[PDB]
Symmetry: C2
């Protein structure tokens, strides 16, 4: 029997930016090991994310995708199902919140959720600040400061979360990586125990650190952010997924 029969796999620079990941996933299916993709992305729906993976010869279904949008929508539901919500974000966050059946408000909201909105305005940020000062909770989908695009490093959701927090002097509760919350939620979905599940990623600051705080073993592959060049080391560290022995 295997040591790890559960796999939480990162998308942000791990599954792509390559077909070394395709063979890795194919093998996981041949050994019939269940897995679940985890991403700090709060803009795309799971169906959208899954299609991008299939487009790169990577077996993925919408059910095998777990976003910070879904994790946040689940997390807030636990705190108060009748909570009226003001949110900043796009399609992905909006859908997940609506499927959960939340109502929506503005300055008089109970919970403020901060997701990436690449068309955010001063007024959108203003309503968020006003609601928080009225007593509303401040939740953020992810704390990523920079977003890698063709133009360069665009401002991430963490930066906009910083604005709101600074102006209101209220610290925010982050859901996505490296916070353990997104890992705890994904683990319930995957259905495997904490000691038989390993988190796979490329970035120590998000992926690896999320697994450690969650109590999960970690595999660090250098196909992304963190180079071979910290206080807690990952459980494993390799150049490629080709070096994984499926322990």
């Amino acid at each position: 029997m295997r040591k790890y029969n559960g796999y939480l796999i990162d998308l942000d620079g791990t599954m792509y930016r390559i077909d070394a990941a395709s063979g890795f996933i194919k093998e996981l299916n041949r050994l019939h090991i269940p897995y679940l993709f985890v991403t700090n992305n709060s803009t795309r729906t799971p169906e959208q994310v899954a299609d991008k993976l299939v487009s790169l010869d990577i077996p993925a279904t919408p059910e095998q995708i777990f976003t910070s949008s879904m994790a946040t929508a689940n997390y807030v539901y636990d705190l108060d199902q009748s909570a009226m919500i003001y949110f900043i974000g796009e399609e992905g966050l909006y859908k997940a919140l609506k499927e959960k059946g939340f109502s929506f408000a503005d300055e008089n909201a109970d919970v403020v959720i901060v997701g990436l909105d690449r068309e955010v305005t001063y007024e959108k940020l203003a309503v968020a600040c006003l609601a928080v000062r009225n007593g509303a909770k401040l939740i953020s989908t992810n704390g990523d400061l920079a977003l890698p695009t063709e133009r360069g490093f665009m401002p991430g959701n963490g930066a906009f979360t910083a604005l709101i927090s600074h102006s209101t002097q209220v610290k925010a509760t982050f859901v996505g990586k490296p916070e353990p919350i997104i890992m705890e939620q994904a683990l319930k979905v995957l259905g495997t125990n904490k000691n038989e599940t390993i988190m796979v990623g490329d970035n120590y600051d998000t992926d690896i650190l999320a697994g450690i705080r969650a109590g999960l073993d970690t595999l660090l592959v250098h196909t992304g952010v963190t180079t071979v060049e910290y206080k807690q080391q990952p459980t494993y560290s390799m150049k490629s997924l080709d070096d994984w022995k499926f322990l």
Copy 2:
């Protein structure tokens, strides 16, 4: 013969709250005019033009010209100009900041700007903030007109200039140079315009944390009005204190 032959009058704080302080300011300013003592109004504001502020002052029987109004946006523009006349500028802000940079005959640019200037823009967008981040990562200097995190309005506390500076600074991991109070740079730039010597100039305000502290850091003597026993006690435990503390502008001897 005089110790203070140059005055820098704060517009912010609660300096002009109520008919009493307004008339006390009017007589104070008129006396400065009566004695031919040069003076200059100082503010962190960016929602008004020097023309607008001067028009409001004269309305309240307080003699002032647009040339006697000095904002942090003007200080920021002048400070950058003296450092680099050929600096290509991207800025986030409104009418006041735009006009201030216009007066300097700058060239403007986006992602390849040499200097990024952040001021309050109540119609800011993701793209506006994104361009700022891109330019900074392209090596542009990050300058902020002021650092106010919150802005008090009818609706409550709206996000201020400092909050947006924080976004850009956090995203690009580059620290910002703040010009407005309580930073000394705005007062240094005010002295340039006032024309008097630093040791012969006094800054007058009624708020320590933002207004007065800027003058102290700039090396100017400071007068703190609208103060009581309790507040003076507080300040005597700070690292720095105002040079003088009085209850009213009525109490000020011109030296």
